[PDB]
Design a binder for this molecule. Structure first.
Ligand SMILES: Cc1cc2nc3c(=O)[nH]c(=O)nc-3n(C[C@H](O)[C@H](O)[C@H](O)COP(=O)(O)O)c2cc1C
Ligand SMILES: Cc1cc2nc3c(=O)[nH]c(=O)nc-3n(C[C@H](O)[C@H](O)[C@H](O)COP(=O)(O)O)c2cc1C
Lengths: 217, 217
């Protein structure tokens, strides 16, 4: 099988973790750098990836399922790490300056060009909310990073469970300081599936017919 | 360098294509199958990938820049193929029926189990607009597929240019029948970069400091 196809046909959404297996620090470092290298519109990188690693942090994450989507709750303590994909509520010229200043330091643009680079900020203004927020534009950028992570995990042979069945309001309460100025609509559990109890590990993957999703013109 | 990191450090946004080079049909088939295999919330797959391959289709795509974002226009005819990432405007039971029906055909689930499997639809209703549209939920799913595509292209060593600088309204007119019931906010040109005029090929990649985007708890 073609290496790319094999990876994508074999990755799947785990429904049960093995609590005695952890992701190595070597593999976690590759995953985190892969997230950091994700592309985004105008290199805005309007995101924050919060890694739930310690037992203390796992408890806080476990508690965020207090009143909602409790089918996802068992994974928190059983998996190795949980990663929260947060997207920025409002993206400002100051936030963009952080990006452009780093670009000047990394040698891709010069100081005079920096002011010239501020024209791309047009894209941010084109995506302003009725309330002055940009979440409808920043959230999709975080999902791009998520697509990148799922492909990355398939290559490392690490199991995972993407989760939209989370409580954004409660997470904003529990991780008050960390999520300040951001919102989180999706999380990702990673680890190793249970050798016998993960029923999804043996089910066939199902997707729509090629002609139903692809059109060649 | 670690294979995953090398791929992600070496992929970049091409700013000029070599018009004499095309993506092979074998590579294109891998890319399209990779898109089809993308994960999505509840396996909704609320997308359509429109591939602009023919000269006739390239002309139509070229014409969609008549009013705005002309800086992206030169790539259309110069690149090999352009792929439109379309997300569904409103997701219904009928739509989910196509997913569940294919699931049974794939032997992932049974006919009787199909009706029980319909209980995941809570997520769709959960994301329903006051206008009965789910575009704020479907668009992020398409961006996940895009993140998957960018990683896939890095592995195939094919150059690309993601584009949000497009005209969704004009695209809806030009590709009237193909985009009916969908909207398109992002496109992707693929091909091979110009050997000496793609300035971005020799510029360093720049991303925020690890500490600025990642928090370990
Ligand atoms: C954005 C998103 C949210 C999802 N949320 C959940 C969730 O809350 N819990 C869970 O068990 N699965 C969830 N999934 C898993 C999907 O059901 C799964 O990706 C889809 O059925 C395709 O199957 P595969 O992932 O096994 O290929 C989610 C996937 C995505 C990409
Ligand atoms: C959603 C999205 C939209 C983008 N739109 C454009 C575009 O319209 N034109 C273009 O030249 N570059 C565009 N880019 C390219 C980004 O500027 C680029 O991904 C970002 O600067 C990081 O650089 P790299 O892609 O070179 O790593 C876009 C990227 C993304 C992911």
């Amino acid at each position: 099988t073609h290496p790319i196809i094999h990876d994508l046909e074999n990755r799947y959404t785990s429904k049960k973790y093995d609590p005695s297996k952890k992701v190595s620090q070597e593999d976690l470092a590759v995953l985190l750098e892969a997230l950091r290298l994700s592309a985004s519109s105008i290199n805005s990188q309007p995101w924050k990836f919060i890694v739930i690693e310690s037992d203390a942090a796992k408890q806080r994450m476990h508690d965020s399922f207090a009143n909602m989507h409790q089918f996802n709750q068992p994974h928190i303590k059983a998996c190795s790490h949980v990663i929260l994909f947060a997207n920025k509520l409002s993206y400002t010229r100051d936030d963009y300056d952080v990006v452009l200043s780093k670009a000047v330091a990394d040698k891709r643009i010069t100081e005079e060009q920096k002011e010239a680079a501020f024209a791309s900020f047009k894209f941010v203004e084109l995506n302003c909310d009725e309330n002055g927020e940009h979440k409808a534009w920043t959230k999709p950028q975080a999902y791009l990073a998520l697509g990148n992570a799922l492909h990355t995990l398939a290559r490392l042979n690490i199991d995972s469970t993407t989760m939209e069945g989370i409580d954004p309001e409660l997470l904003s309460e529990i991780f008050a300081d960390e999520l300040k100025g951001y919102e989180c609509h999706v999380a990702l559990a990673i680890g190793y599936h249970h050798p016998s109890e993960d029923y999804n590990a043996s089910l066939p993957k199902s997707r729509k017919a090629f002609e139903d999703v692809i059109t060649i013109l």
